Every structure is written in C-alpha cells, then in structure tokens.
Ligand binder design. Structure first.
Ligand SMILES: [Zn+2]
Ligand SMILES: [Zn+2]
Ligand SMILES: [Zn+2]
Lengths: 252, 193, 207, 47
C-alpha cells in the first residue's frame, strides 16, 4: 500500500500520469491519486454548443452542434424571428445540459426573447465547425431526398443517419457514443470532487512510534478500516488507526 | 447476410467495411454492393510538419489508433522528408499516405520513395489535435533534457506508452498492435475460406 | 522472452552501423551513426525504447555501451541492462546490402532498404511468416494475457438492481458477473443467481 | 422559518462576537449553521 503510494509518486515525478491510470495500475484509491495530481506544480468543454441558421429549398433550417463530439440537432423553422429561435433554444436546453452557447452576430440571435431564455435557463451567450456540419448535412439530405415527400422528414432522417450510422475517428465510434462517454466522464469527476471536500473537512492528531506526544494536525485524505492516509509537510504517510485521533476542523 | 446488407445499404447507405464487419461477409461482396449503388483502413498514415524553437519537426500519425512518430529535421528540403518516409516504411507496414498542399510533399525524391515502396499518396482533423497534445507534453517535461531532440523523443515515449485515455482505456501502442494483428488474422481467414 | 532486445555495432565501408535485434522474432532495426560516442548510442536507445516496448537490453562489454549517457537513458526508461545472433543478422544485412547496392547512391538508403527487405520480404520459418508478423503476434499474445487478468475485475466492478418474483421493490446492489443476451448472472450475498434481462438495471453508481 | 434568524445572527456576531450556543438558543437556528457562523469569522475560534 505504502509501496504503491511511493511508486505512484515516483512514476508521476517521471512521466506525469493522470489519476485514473495511477488508480488502475498501482491499486490505490481514487482520492489519493487525485491528491497526487493536485500536489504537482506543473499540472495546474463538455457543455458548449454552437448554433447557426441556413436555407434549403426555400425553408429555414436551424442547426445546433455539440462541439466536442459533433452531435447535431436540427429543426425547420416557419420564419426567422426571435421567438422561434428562443423556443428552439428552450427545447435544446430542456433536453441536454447546455451551459455555454456560441452564436454569430445575426438579428434573431440578438433579441430580447433569446436573452430572456438565456437568463431563465442560465446560459452564457457568446458572439463570434458549424459550416462544415451544414455542408455534410446538406450532402446527406441530397443523398436520401427521394425517400421522403416533405422536407422535414428528410432533415430528420439525415440527422439520424449522421448521428448513429456514420462511424469514424480514433476508436471507430459514432457521435452518440462520443457525447454519452464525454458527459459520463464529467459526471464521475463532479461526484468525486464532492466526496473529496466532504472527507477533507477533518483533522488528525497522530502519535509516532516510541513516543508519547501527539504530533501536528495533519490533513485527512482517506479513512480506511485499519489505515489512515494523511498529508503533512507536502508528504503523504500511512498511519494505523490505533495511533490516530480524528477531530473536526472549523478553519474556513 | 447478403440480403441484410443490401437492405441496410438501401435504407441508410453504409460503406463496405462497416457492413463487412457487422454482417460478417467477405469484403468483395460488400464492395460490389456499394459499387452497384448509383447514389454513391489499418494502413493509413497522415503526415505533417510544424515549427518549434526555430526547429522543423515532422510528425506522422497512424489514424486508426493515434500512434505518433516524430523527428527533428535540420531543414525543410525534400531529401530529408523522403529519408523520414523511407524509415517509416521500413519500420511499419505503410500502404496509404495522406498529406496537405505543401512544398516538400510534392518532390521527385518523395515520389521516388513512394513509387519504390508502393504507397498511395493523397493530398488534402486528427493531426492538429495530435500536434497540440505533443506540444503540451513537450512543454511539460522540457526542463528534464537540455537538447530539444531528447525532449521530443521523451514526449513521444510518454504519448505512446503512458497516456491511457479514450473510451476503452487503452494506450496507443497496444491499439496499433491489436489492430494490425486482428487485421492479419481476418485476411488469413478470408483467404483460407 | 517477448521483450528482450540485443544491440551491437559494426563497420561497413568506413562507416558505423548500429543494429538492434528482437530475439524471439528476428526483427531488425538499424541506423548509421556518424561516430561511436555515448551520446549517439543513448539517442538511438531512446528512439528504440520510444518506438517499441523494451524492458531487457543485452549488450557486450564495449566502449560506448558502458557509459553515463546509456546508464541515464536506461534509468529514465526503466530498462534492465545486461552485459555478456546479432553477428548472423549482421552478415545477413551485409549480404542484402551488397545485393541491392546498385540501386542507391548513398549508404543510408541502402541500409534502410535492406531493413525493409529483411523485415517484410523474407518469408521462411515454420508457418511461413516474416519477422514483422511474428513480432506483432508475440506481443499481442502477451498483452492479451495480462489485460484479460485485469479486465475480469473491471467487469466485476459494476452494480445491478434486480427484481424478484411477486414483489414490487428493487433489491440491493448485487455484483455483476456476466451479462448475456436474455439472462444476467449476479452474485448477491455470496449466492449466484440468474435473472432475466427485463428485471435488471446495471449502473456504475458514482456515489 | 429561521432564515431571517440566520441573517440576524450574522449581524449580531458582526457586532458583538457571540459564541455558537448563545446564538442557537436566542435565534432558534440549528447548531450546524451557528457553528458555521462562528467558523467563518477570522478572530473567533469555536470552543
Ligand atoms: Zn504532474
Ligand atoms: Zn448507396
Ligand atoms: Zn467573531
């Protein structure tokens, strides 16, 4: 265990690994490897979307693309006013976690209805991939046009073919597997951060071997069944539980 | 399998490799299915060049696994690019090469090496991400080596065998070895059967 | 052993050639050095360890192979160095170089083309494989063994909420063993059981 | 509720620097928020 912590610290000193790889290799828990990463001085987006509009056969299409995976949601608008763009933004924010929106300096994107929707849904709007996605979507639309009667059915069938039937990239996945994996990794990071702060609200007085004095207040990191990992003086050490006293610390 | 592949291609217009994987068909049948539609790669390497601290660095990436290979060049001529391409062809099996509209990538020595090794040269968003990651690693461990060439080779070692990222949680060297081994077994079974 | 390499140096037309050989497959990497100092030897060893996984290096009692640069590179790359095939591979490479000598101007192109010919155009052995197919097969087999032993525990780190017969509450987080097409094998209180797929929910439960 | 009690307890500790048991008995707020009000002051120490 302590040999695992020493090997992990030497391995991060050489190669600067990440905490998932160290937790899998050296068989240490995740909070300890995250603290090893958090102590390195040389080591210190999944919710950004881009929106645009286009024209196709006299219809006004609006396209929203998740940037980090290439995930497309499209719709056919009856006009190009601000209320319909605000309604499309409200549906998009109600289905996926949207935290940062990037648009161009158009008329309908600079409107009081879109600003009210961004205020109620807590989205940061920023004015300046989407043109390449519009080009690829129009190629698919002209490829499967003869199987539909209206234009909305062709738009939604092209969205389905782009999202789940086209595979590429490094691992050979589509866009839906990429966006689900990215958001799941971010969720794991936030849950681990909550556990880290809740554990680190404590304090430990420990007694060394062949001594009867209590030592300085070291910060608790991991409280096991028989072992306790503490940080003191930029050093991690493992003390057994029968030589330690854990108190609360109100030191904000 | 052939009927399911024809129905799937009539609906969604898939390519031949994904159909041959998902339906377990020999690849020539899926090739003819794709070729009969009127409405319509483990040996591909992408090459690029960049500048860093007054030097010229040439970087080749195996695309299906993200496997990097870098070198420090003394110049941006065509002879050194042809020499790096000959070393890359002599180390790994290379069949298809992709580059951009550059100067040293259209040369007599480069075309002679591509002819002698029988590589399909094509001209034209993965290589920029690989160069960005390589720049971050180079600036991360710059203070451990005096020369720039040693730092580039240590960054290549760290990027290939120490970064277990992605979905599956696999490094780049294990991915390229598994891809080429599985492709060799698949071609052997399709040649036997 | 699937990760043992041997190194040597030779002279050819007044030059210095350095030859590294993977033993279990006969795989050859070679370069032309402008000198015989320790720095170029350490640089070639660093490029070899950055391309392929090297763990055990075997050399002789030479001049540049016993130096601070090679010792520092082996320390930083965690390679085990031992001092004491390569001569046979050197004679083979010299014969191929003399066979295709009249197609190249310089000696460096001849060395690299002979490396390509020896690695991918000389099929022999038992099954009829070249050196590259053999080294890829050997390394893939060893990596498959070790990663199988880790991936079993990786698939047993999931949590399953299941339902029993004639009770409308979801039972506790049993451990997944195997997930079939119409059945799921779980371990609950050291009891193995098989539930249908439509009565289970498999999550990872971050928290 | 006691949310206005939390506001008035913050003002009262800003003036007079009470302890946590006195504020918990006077303003009828729970003990955790009273100990946090004492903890976020740089001059006082909860004891
Ligand atoms: Zn670090
Ligand atoms: Zn087609
Ligand atoms: Zn106070």
């Amino acid at each position: 265990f302590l040999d695992g912590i020493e090997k992990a610290q030497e391995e991060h000193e050489k190669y600067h690994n990440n905490w998932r790889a160290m937790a899998e290799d050296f068989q240490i828990p995740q909070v300890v490897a995250k603290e090893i990463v958090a102590q390195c001085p040389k080591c210190q987006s999944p919710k950004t979307w881009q929106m645009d509009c286009t024209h196709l056969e006299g219809k006004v299409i609006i396209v929203a693309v998740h940037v980090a995976s290439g995930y497309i949601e499209a719709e056919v608008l009856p006009a190009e006013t601000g209320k319909e763009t605000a309604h499309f933004l409200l549906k998009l924010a109600a289905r996926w976690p949207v935290k940062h929106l990037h648009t161009d300096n158009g008329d309908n994107f600079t409107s009081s209805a879109v600003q009210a929707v961004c205020w109620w849904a807590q989205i940061e709007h920023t004015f300046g991939v989407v043109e390449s996605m519009n080009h690829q979507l129009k190629t698919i639309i002209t490829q499967i046009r003869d199987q539909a009667e209206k234009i909305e059915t062709a738009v939604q069938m092209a969205v389905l073919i782009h999202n789940f039937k086209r595979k590429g990239g490094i691992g050979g996945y589509s866009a839906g597997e990429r966006i689900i994996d990215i958001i799941a990794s971010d969720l794991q990071t936030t849950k681990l951060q909550n556990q880290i702060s809740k554990i680190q609200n404590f304090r430990v007085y420990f007694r060394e071997g062949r001594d009867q004095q209590w030592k300085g207040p070291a910060t608790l990191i991991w409280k096991g069944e028989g072992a306790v990992v503490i940080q003191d003086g930029q050093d991690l050490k493992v003390v057994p539980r029968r030589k330690c006293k854990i108190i609360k610390d109100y030191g904000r």
